[PDB]
């Protein structure tokens, strides 16, 4: 079990954490997280405490939400995702800058996406699974000082794969519509 | 979004958890969460604590296990796909030794399976592929592996002929 640990090139506190995986024809085994090698990452005595599941859509953005407090690692174990992680610190010099990781089965990269940055995700395979692991101080009253922003955010720019995703549950009735 | 946990002891395997989470489902897909520490970790014994994730993923007709040892706990489901998993009592001394539980596990039948030290594991996958998520807990190889098609624990499996080695694929 190994990690490959690396600050990012541009938004400081983010890590880009990649396992090592062992792959033959039947298919793939691998590490996400060990509290010793990860949870090492956080705030003294802080550790992740949850784990969540997001299957999507082709096509389906989720994001950018974000808050004060929550640290997030997240990663693509089903598919292909765009993950996108914006510093909404507004005291850093890369405040609303971005960076986007391209996540899929040969590229297992593992994101920690500190407090005080908007997370988001685009699914363009077929349909994709998000892990996330969250940790956060305070079990008990939902986090103050949250934000949503919009995925197509004027300030942000994102650069998404397309113009046209699905957001809204609404908004996939346009889409495949069977013949 | 509530979290919620339905939590029930198997009735067959004394030490086996049955965890069955809330979902939201819609047309853009589904959301929820596998685990907490506080209601999850409390499951196990003297403060012990869940702390490795790890991901399998196989094609189709792949068969995993059966493996377990003393000292390591498990907790266990299907992420995509489909899966029949199987926990075994590996315990020499306990009054269900060779018995085993089995669960088809999928999107619409989200258990997720707590499989305590002294338990063997197993699964096998009835989808075009699917990956398997489980977390350990403890404070080489397996101490025990047994095979799939042991007699002496006789599982009932969708097939007798799985893929057990990267020939036979």
Do not use: M
Not at 102 to 118: E, H, M, R, T
Request: proline share 4%.
């Amino acid at each position: 079990i190994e990690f490959n640990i690396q600050e990012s090139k541009i938004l400081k506190g983010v890590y880009i954490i990649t396992p090592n995986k062992f792959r033959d024809l039947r298919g793939e085994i691998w590490t996400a997280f060990t509290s010793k090698a990860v949870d090492k990452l956080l705030p003294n005595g802080l550790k992740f405490i949850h784990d969540k599941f997001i299957h999507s859509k082709h096509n389906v953005i989720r994001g950018i939400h974000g808050d004060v407090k929550t640290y997030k690692l997240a990663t693509c174990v089903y598919g292909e995702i765009h993950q996108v992680v914006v510093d909404c610190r507004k005291d850093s010099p890369t405040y609303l800058k971005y960076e986007k990781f391209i996540i899929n089965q040969d590229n297992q990269q593992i994101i920690l996406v500190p407090a005080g940055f908007g997370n988001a995700h685009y699914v363009t395979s077929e349909s994709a699974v998000y892990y996330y692991k969250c940790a956060y101080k305070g079990d008990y009253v939902d986090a103050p000082d949250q934000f949503t922003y919009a995925w197509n955010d004027e300030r942000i720019g994102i650069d998404w794969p397309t113009n046209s995703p699905i957001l809204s549950e609404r908004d996939i009735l346009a889409t495949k519509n069977k013949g």
